[PDB]
């Protein structure tokens, strides 16, 4: 089975997604897509797809009232990504209660892949993650050391890792470091043949994993 | 002149906004609105309005490529709010270059109003703000001490302060502490008569300011 989550930050056709459906673990929908296609067209695009997870990633980072106002308009999603750094009281606690009541999963951003991401607040972020107890956490694919350490610190958590391909991540390295799934965007959706690239990347990963 | 920025996180009619136009400094457009009305309807709503600033607040917090992909679909806006905590290299630096080239202002989130917002990284966030040199910064209206201190640390910056009304901020207290404008949402858009409430709040503020 595939370990890839498609970061659909540019539109792909419905027919393409239907082939990918059984060769992806999930699809991660971002603001760039929702602003390109619009909300209605975005929902239509995702309807028939049989993937384990439809994740909405608007990198949620506001007070609870606002984060809840956002996600209630995105009920087609199974899961949602929010930032850990915003903290618990009056922000993530309120969102967690909401998602729990509405049968949605929460993934929290722990480490990002760009150089500008500060390492300085790992302890704070880990504490936030411990209090909230999300389904999963996002640990950057350029940040292999942190993936292994987060895997150590959170053995039962789903770990998802973006930054594979364009941002530097060599396919399968994040999974080998301890991630469950790799989030891949441009490497697929900007390829000549997105399905072919997904199949090639899947092959690379299942070789590395083994 | 008004010191109020309307946080339009729920739809208000075009006619209402036209009266407010000369009694607001700006209007802050969020994800809740864009997801409620949709993108096209949101743009239409904002077209004729004569306010100093149309600010889009999606609390931007991603890598540069993604933040740029978001804001280029929101060109109706004069200004954009992003989080400081995401850092500079490969995130805010790339967004700043983009906004500069496209004649847009950047406001960075420095302190939020909820209890869960950590105070621990004030130095890091201030450093990020110093490197980027945004038009403005967002300093929570419940966090009066921080407003005065940020005003001290950044004398020339525009300081905008949400959290007035529902979240606790007593109208005008943020301006008196050193903020330029107060961001107000529910107090206005959930009032029986939103125009009447804006006028009353404006009166309260111009009394306090004096």
mmCIF file of N, CA and C in Angstrom, chain A residues 1-8 17 20-30 33 45-57 74-82 99 103-108 134-138 156-161 180-184:
data_model
loop_
_atom_site.group_PDB
_atom_site.id
_atom_site.type_symbol
_atom_site.label_atom_id
_atom_site.label_comp_id
_atom_site.label_asym_id
_atom_site.label_seq_id
_atom_site.Cartn_x
_atom_site.Cartn_y
_atom_site.Cartn_z
ATOM 1 N N UNK A 1 0.809 -1.215 0.000
ATOM 2 C CA UNK A 1 0.000 0.000 0.000
ATOM 3 C C UNK A 1 0.846 1.271 0.000
ATOM 4 N N UNK A 2 0.301 2.329 -0.595
ATOM 5 C CA UNK A 2 1.011 3.596 -0.730
ATOM 6 C C UNK A 2 1.206 4.295 0.607
ATOM 7 N N UNK A 3 2.290 5.057 0.690
ATOM 8 C CA UNK A 3 2.633 5.818 1.873
ATOM 9 C C UNK A 3 2.573 7.291 1.530
ATOM 10 N N UNK A 4 2.011 7.599 0.368
ATOM 11 C CA UNK A 4 2.015 8.973 -0.133
ATOM 12 C C UNK A 4 0.709 9.719 0.116
ATOM 13 N N UNK A 5 0.830 10.945 0.617
ATOM 14 C CA UNK A 5 -0.311 11.848 0.697
ATOM 15 C C UNK A 5 -0.088 12.940 -0.342
ATOM 16 N N UNK A 6 -0.987 13.045 -1.318
ATOM 17 C CA UNK A 6 -0.853 14.063 -2.350
ATOM 18 C C UNK A 6 -1.160 15.442 -1.791
ATOM 19 N N UNK A 7 -0.218 16.370 -1.935
ATOM 20 C CA UNK A 7 -0.496 17.748 -1.552
ATOM 21 C C UNK A 7 -1.069 18.437 -2.766
ATOM 22 N N UNK A 8 -2.393 18.474 -2.849
ATOM 23 C CA UNK A 8 -3.022 19.069 -4.015
ATOM 24 C C UNK A 8 -3.150 20.569 -3.843
ATOM 25 N N UNK A 17 -7.348 11.761 -10.355
ATOM 26 C CA UNK A 17 -7.470 11.428 -8.941
ATOM 27 C C UNK A 17 -8.055 10.029 -8.736
ATOM 28 N N UNK A 20 -5.293 7.565 -8.947
ATOM 29 C CA UNK A 20 -4.428 7.733 -7.788
ATOM 30 C C UNK A 20 -5.082 7.189 -6.531
ATOM 31 N N UNK A 21 -6.413 7.211 -6.493
ATOM 32 C CA UNK A 21 -7.150 6.889 -5.276
ATOM 33 C C UNK A 21 -6.647 5.629 -4.559
ATOM 34 N N UNK A 22 -6.374 4.569 -5.318
ATOM 35 C CA UNK A 22 -5.936 3.314 -4.718
ATOM 36 C C UNK A 22 -4.416 3.202 -4.677
ATOM 37 N N UNK A 23 -3.746 4.310 -4.980
ATOM 38 C CA UNK A 23 -2.291 4.378 -4.897
ATOM 39 C C UNK A 23 -1.838 5.609 -4.123
ATOM 40 N N UNK A 24 -2.737 6.096 -3.272
ATOM 41 C CA UNK A 24 -2.439 7.138 -2.303
ATOM 42 C C UNK A 24 -2.992 6.671 -0.982
ATOM 43 N N UNK A 25 -2.379 7.095 0.116
ATOM 44 C CA UNK A 25 -3.033 6.941 1.405
ATOM 45 C C UNK A 25 -4.077 8.037 1.591
ATOM 46 N N UNK A 26 -3.729 9.245 1.161
ATOM 47 C CA UNK A 26 -4.594 10.389 1.358
ATOM 48 C C UNK A 26 -4.297 11.511 0.387
ATOM 49 N N UNK A 27 -5.115 12.549 0.472
ATOM 50 C CA UNK A 27 -4.958 13.744 -0.326
ATOM 51 C C UNK A 27 -5.067 14.914 0.637
ATOM 52 N N UNK A 28 -4.119 15.838 0.549
ATOM 53 C CA UNK A 28 -4.085 16.999 1.434
ATOM 54 C C UNK A 28 -4.460 18.243 0.627
ATOM 55 N N UNK A 29 -5.594 18.838 0.989
ATOM 56 C CA UNK A 29 -6.159 19.973 0.278
ATOM 57 C C UNK A 29 -5.755 21.278 0.954
ATOM 58 N N UNK A 30 -5.173 22.206 0.195
ATOM 59 C CA UNK A 30 -4.693 23.458 0.751
ATOM 60 C C UNK A 30 -5.480 24.687 0.345
ATOM 61 N N UNK A 33 -5.549 25.625 -3.539
ATOM 62 C CA UNK A 33 -6.547 24.931 -4.354
ATOM 63 C C UNK A 33 -7.915 25.542 -4.159
ATOM 64 N N UNK A 45 -14.816 18.138 -6.551
ATOM 65 C CA UNK A 45 -13.632 17.404 -6.972
ATOM 66 C C UNK A 45 -13.333 16.199 -6.078
ATOM 67 N N UNK A 46 -13.636 16.326 -4.786
ATOM 68 C CA UNK A 46 -13.226 15.327 -3.800
ATOM 69 C C UNK A 46 -14.260 14.247 -3.490
ATOM 70 N N UNK A 47 -15.429 14.340 -4.115
ATOM 71 C CA UNK A 47 -16.579 13.531 -3.707
ATOM 72 C C UNK A 47 -16.433 12.009 -3.819
ATOM 73 N N UNK A 48 -16.153 11.501 -5.013
ATOM 74 C CA UNK A 48 -16.130 10.059 -5.218
ATOM 75 C C UNK A 48 -14.876 9.335 -4.750
ATOM 76 N N UNK A 49 -13.836 10.095 -4.416
ATOM 77 C CA UNK A 49 -12.507 9.535 -4.177
ATOM 78 C C UNK A 49 -12.431 8.583 -2.984
ATOM 79 N N UNK A 50 -11.969 7.362 -3.234
ATOM 80 C CA UNK A 50 -11.775 6.387 -2.172
ATOM 81 C C UNK A 50 -10.334 6.376 -1.672
ATOM 82 N N UNK A 51 -10.007 7.347 -0.827
ATOM 83 C CA UNK A 51 -8.732 7.340 -0.132
ATOM 84 C C UNK A 51 -9.005 7.259 1.361
ATOM 85 N N UNK A 52 -8.027 6.782 2.122
ATOM 86 C CA UNK A 52 -8.195 6.666 3.559
ATOM 87 C C UNK A 52 -8.468 8.034 4.180
ATOM 88 N N UNK A 53 -7.719 9.048 3.755
ATOM 89 C CA UNK A 53 -7.829 10.361 4.386
ATOM 90 C C UNK A 53 -7.900 11.534 3.417
ATOM 91 N N UNK A 54 -8.918 12.363 3.616
ATOM 92 C CA UNK A 54 -8.957 13.675 3.003
ATOM 93 C C UNK A 54 -8.611 14.665 4.108
ATOM 94 N N UNK A 55 -7.431 15.269 3.977
ATOM 95 C CA UNK A 55 -6.928 16.184 4.986
ATOM 96 C C UNK A 55 -7.003 17.602 4.462
ATOM 97 N N UNK A 56 -7.599 18.493 5.246
ATOM 98 C CA UNK A 56 -7.601 19.897 4.880
ATOM 99 C C UNK A 56 -6.467 20.556 5.661
ATOM 100 N N UNK A 57 -5.580 21.230 4.930
ATOM 101 C CA UNK A 57 -4.439 21.910 5.538
ATOM 102 C C UNK A 57 -4.503 23.406 5.228
ATOM 103 N N UNK A 74 -15.964 22.949 6.116
ATOM 104 C CA UNK A 74 -15.108 22.014 5.387
ATOM 105 C C UNK A 74 -15.386 20.563 5.789
ATOM 106 N N UNK A 75 -16.654 20.252 6.044
ATOM 107 C CA UNK A 75 -17.044 18.949 6.583
ATOM 108 C C UNK A 75 -16.767 17.752 5.663
ATOM 109 N N UNK A 76 -16.407 18.006 4.413
ATOM 110 C CA UNK A 76 -16.093 16.900 3.509
ATOM 111 C C UNK A 76 -14.797 16.214 3.950
ATOM 112 N N UNK A 77 -13.985 16.937 4.714
ATOM 113 C CA UNK A 77 -12.683 16.443 5.165
ATOM 114 C C UNK A 77 -12.785 15.441 6.306
ATOM 115 N N UNK A 78 -11.889 14.459 6.314
ATOM 116 C CA UNK A 78 -11.760 13.557 7.461
ATOM 117 C C UNK A 78 -10.897 14.162 8.573
ATOM 118 N N UNK A 79 -9.928 14.990 8.184
ATOM 119 C CA UNK A 79 -8.890 15.441 9.108
ATOM 120 C C UNK A 79 -8.475 16.868 8.797
ATOM 121 N N UNK A 80 -7.870 17.526 9.785
ATOM 122 C CA UNK A 80 -7.480 18.922 9.668
ATOM 123 C C UNK A 80 -6.111 19.148 10.296
ATOM 124 N N UNK A 81 -5.292 19.963 9.640
ATOM 125 C CA UNK A 81 -3.978 20.326 10.165
ATOM 126 C C UNK A 81 -4.049 21.705 10.832
ATOM 127 N N UNK A 82 -3.567 21.771 12.069
ATOM 128 C CA UNK A 82 -3.422 23.036 12.790
ATOM 129 C C UNK A 82 -2.008 23.164 13.318
ATOM 130 N N UNK A 99 -13.750 19.019 16.891
ATOM 131 C CA UNK A 99 -13.449 17.976 15.919
ATOM 132 C C UNK A 99 -13.872 16.619 16.472
ATOM 133 N N UNK A 103 -16.497 13.923 14.701
ATOM 134 C CA UNK A 103 -15.803 12.738 14.165
ATOM 135 C C UNK A 103 -14.696 13.085 13.183
ATOM 136 N N UNK A 104 -13.934 14.126 13.503
ATOM 137 C CA UNK A 104 -12.810 14.535 12.656
ATOM 138 C C UNK A 104 -11.495 14.311 13.393
ATOM 139 N N UNK A 105 -10.432 14.043 12.636
ATOM 140 C CA UNK A 105 -9.093 13.914 13.203
ATOM 141 C C UNK A 105 -8.342 15.247 13.173
ATOM 142 N N UNK A 106 -7.450 15.440 14.143
ATOM 143 C CA UNK A 106 -6.584 16.617 14.188
ATOM 144 C C UNK A 106 -5.132 16.187 14.026
ATOM 145 N N UNK A 107 -4.413 16.883 13.149
ATOM 146 C CA UNK A 107 -2.961 16.737 13.009
ATOM 147 C C UNK A 107 -2.326 18.065 13.393
ATOM 148 N N UNK A 108 -1.291 18.034 14.237
ATOM 149 C CA UNK A 108 -0.647 19.275 14.661
ATOM 150 C C UNK A 108 0.738 19.430 14.038
ATOM 151 N N UNK A 134 -3.458 14.742 19.561
ATOM 152 C CA UNK A 134 -4.006 14.695 18.201
ATOM 153 C C UNK A 134 -3.902 13.289 17.606
ATOM 154 N N UNK A 135 -4.610 13.036 16.510
ATOM 155 C CA UNK A 135 -4.439 11.793 15.756
ATOM 156 C C UNK A 135 -3.003 11.701 15.243
ATOM 157 N N UNK A 136 -2.476 12.835 14.791
ATOM 158 C CA UNK A 136 -1.184 12.859 14.132
ATOM 159 C C UNK A 136 -0.433 14.165 14.289
ATOM 160 N N UNK A 137 0.798 14.178 13.783
ATOM 161 C CA UNK A 137 1.633 15.368 13.804
ATOM 162 C C UNK A 137 2.395 15.472 12.501
ATOM 163 N N UNK A 138 2.686 16.706 12.109
ATOM 164 C CA UNK A 138 3.402 16.975 10.878
ATOM 165 C C UNK A 138 4.857 17.258 11.242
ATOM 166 N N UNK A 156 2.773 6.108 19.212
ATOM 167 C CA UNK A 156 1.468 5.721 18.660
ATOM 168 C C UNK A 156 0.874 6.722 17.661
ATOM 169 N N UNK A 157 1.452 7.915 17.609
ATOM 170 C CA UNK A 157 0.962 8.986 16.757
ATOM 171 C C UNK A 157 1.186 8.683 15.279
ATOM 172 N N UNK A 158 0.255 9.103 14.416
ATOM 173 C CA UNK A 158 0.536 9.136 12.979
ATOM 174 C C UNK A 158 1.475 10.303 12.678
ATOM 175 N N UNK A 159 2.591 10.008 12.025
ATOM 176 C CA UNK A 159 3.544 11.044 11.651
ATOM 177 C C UNK A 159 3.506 11.216 10.143
ATOM 178 N N UNK A 160 3.276 12.448 9.701
ATOM 179 C CA UNK A 160 3.212 12.761 8.273
ATOM 180 C C UNK A 160 4.285 13.793 7.974
ATOM 181 N N UNK A 161 4.945 13.630 6.831
ATOM 182 C CA UNK A 161 6.148 14.407 6.547
ATOM 183 C C UNK A 161 6.157 14.982 5.148
ATOM 184 N N UNK A 180 5.042 7.871 9.053
ATOM 185 C CA UNK A 180 4.080 6.938 8.489
ATOM 186 C C UNK A 180 3.822 7.199 7.004
ATOM 187 N N UNK A 181 3.651 8.470 6.661
ATOM 188 C CA UNK A 181 3.318 8.876 5.312
ATOM 189 C C UNK A 181 4.159 10.066 4.889
ATOM 190 N N UNK A 182 4.438 10.140 3.594
ATOM 191 C CA UNK A 182 5.112 11.295 3.015
ATOM 192 C C UNK A 182 4.164 12.154 2.200
ATOM 193 N N UNK A 183 4.197 13.452 2.481
ATOM 194 C CA UNK A 183 3.380 14.416 1.763
ATOM 195 C C UNK A 183 4.173 14.969 0.600
ATOM 196 N N UNK A 184 3.624 14.805 -0.593
ATOM 197 C CA UNK A 184 4.312 15.147 -1.825
ATOM 198 C C UNK A 184 3.392 15.963 -2.717
#
